[PDB]
C-alpha cells in the first residue's frame, strides 16, 4: 500500500559550478562561478556540500511492492484465524476478553440488521465485547514524533474485529464510527486485520452466517475449499504438540 517518494532529479545540479583545480590553497570541489553574491565561490555538487546533491538520490523506481505466493498468503490467514480461537493468544495480544462468554465468539445473525450506532454498542455490551471496545477509545492519543504532521495525527489500540457473511448488511455502518472496531466480510478476510502488527490473537466476533461459511471458504483437511480452487488446509509437522503426553507416555518411559 506504500506510495513512492523520491527527491527531485535535478536537485543540487541547477548550477554551472566547476572545480578551481589545484594551486589555490582550497579543496578541488566544484565551485559556483561569478561574484557579487555570497553564493559565488561556494562548493557545489557534493554530497558533503551545503546545497549539493545527496548521495545515491532516492528514485521512484525503487522496488516498493512484494508478491508473496498466494498459497503462503492463504497459509498465513488460516494460522491467524486459528489463533483467534485460542483465549491465551487473544489475551497475549492485549485484548480484554475477561467477560467474553466463549471463544470463538459467535453471535446471532440479527446483529447484521443493526442500523444505529447506539444499538450497535448495546449489542457489544450483551456479548461482553464492550470492554475491549472501551479500551480502544480510552487509548486515543496523538502520535509521537514527526508522524503527527504527516496526516497521521491520532493512534489507538485495536478493538474487536466483526466478521459478517451477508453482503450489504446494515451493521457495516452502525459499527464503523466506534474507534478500534473493524468490520470485514468473511469471503475476503484480510491478514493485516487478523494479525495487526504481525501479532497473532485478534479478538474476532463472528456472525452465525459468517461462522458457518468457514468450512466452505477454507475447506477441511479431507476435502478442498469450494471458493479456493484446489486448496487444502496445511498440515503441521507434529500431530500432537503436547510434549508432556509424548515424553511421559508409557511407551517412552519404558
Amino acid at each position: 500500500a506504500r506510495q513512492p517518494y523520491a527527491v527531485s532529479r535535478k536537485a543540487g545540479h541547477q548550477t554551472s559550478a566547476e572545480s578551481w583545480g589545484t594551486g589555490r590553497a582550497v579543496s578541488r570541489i566544484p565551485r559556483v562561478p561569478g561574484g557579487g553574491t555570497h553564493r559565488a565561490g561556494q562548493g557545489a555538487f557534493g554530497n558533503m556540500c551545503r546545497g549539493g546533491r545527496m548521495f545515491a538520490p532516492t528514485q521512484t523506481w525503487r522496488r516498493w511492492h512484494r508478491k508473496i505466493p498466494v498459497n503462503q498468503k492463504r497459509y498465513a490467514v488460516a494460522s491467524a484465524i486459528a489463533a483467534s480461537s485460542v483465549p491465551s493468544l487473544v489475551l497475549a495480544r492485549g485484548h480484554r476478553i475477561e467477560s467474553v462468554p466463549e471463544l470463538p465468539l459467535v453471535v446471532s445473525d440479527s446483529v447484521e440488521g443493526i442500523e444505529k450506532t447506539s444499538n450497535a454498542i448495546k449489542a457489544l455490551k450483551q456479548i461482553g465485547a464492550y470492554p475491549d471496545a472501551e479500551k480502544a477509545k480510552d487509548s486515543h492519543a496523538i502520535r509521537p514524533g514527526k508522524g503527527k504532521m504527516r496526516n497521521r495525527r491520532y493512534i489507538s489500540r485495536k478493538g474487536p474485529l466483526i466478521v459478517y457473511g451477508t453482503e450489504g448488511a446494515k451493521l457495516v455502518k452502525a459499527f464503523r464510527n466506534i474507534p478500534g472496531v473493524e468490520i470485514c466480510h468473511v469471503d475476503r478476510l484480510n491478514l493485516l486485520k487478523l494479525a495487526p502488527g504481525g501479532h497473532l490473537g485478534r479478538f474476532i466476533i463472528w456472525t452465525k452466517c459468517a461462522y458457518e461459511k468457514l468450512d466452505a471458504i477454507y475447506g477441511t483437511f479431507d476435502k478442498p475449499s469450494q471458493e479456493k480452487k484446489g486448496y487444502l488446509l496445511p498440515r503441521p509437522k507434529m500431530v500432537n504438540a503436547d510434549l508432556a503426553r509424548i515424553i511421559n507416555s508409557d511407551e517412552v518411559q519404558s
Partner: protein, 132 residues
C-alpha cells in the same frame, strides 16, 4: 470518516484555507452559540456574531462578563465587547479581543435578513432532525 472526494483531510490544506479565508468566509467561521433561552425560542444552535449583538463571555479571565458587541475585527479573528477592556501602562483603555466561540449570544440584532436566516436554520432542524 469523510467520503467526499472533493474534501481534503490534509492538515496543511485545512490550516491554509482557514487563515487565508476571505472576509465573507470569516463571517461564518466566526460563529457563536445562542443562549439556552434563544435556542429554545428560535430552535437554532449557532449564529454568526454581529456588531450590535449582546453576548456573555463564558470562557477566559472575563468569564461571566456581559456586554454589547462593538466591533467584529475579522482580520484578527476576534470581537470587541463594550466595557471588556484593560488598562495600558500609560493608563489608556483598550478593548480586549475575544474569540466568538468563547461567548454566548444573549440578544440578537434582528433585521429583515437576520429573521430570514433564522427561519432557514430552524427549517432544516425541524425536518431533518425531528421528522426523521
Amino acid at each position: 470518516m469523510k467520503y467526499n472526494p472533493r474534501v481534503s483531510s490534509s492538515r496543511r490544506k485545512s490550516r491554509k484555507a482557514h487563515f487565508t479565508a476571505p472576509s465573507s468566509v470569516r463571517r461564518v467561521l466566526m460563529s457563536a452559540p445562542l443562549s439556552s433561552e434563544l435556542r429554545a425560542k428560535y430552535n437554532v444552535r449557532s449564529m454568526p456574531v454581529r456588531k450590535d449583538d449582546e453576548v456573555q463571555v463564558v470562557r477566559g479571565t472575563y468569564k461571566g462578563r456581559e456586554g454589547k458587541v462593538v466591533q467584529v475585527y475579522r482580520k484578527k479573528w476576534v470581537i470587541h465587547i463594550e466595557r471588556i477592556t484593560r488598562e495600558k501602562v500609560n493608563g489608556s483603555t483598550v478593548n480586549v479581543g475575544i474569540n466568538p466561540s468563547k461567548v454566548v449570544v444573549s440578544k440578537l440584532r434582528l433585521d429583515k435578513d437576520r429573521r430570514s436566516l433564522l427561519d432557514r436554520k430552524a427549517k432544516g432542524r425541524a425536518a431533518a432532525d425531528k421528522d426523521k
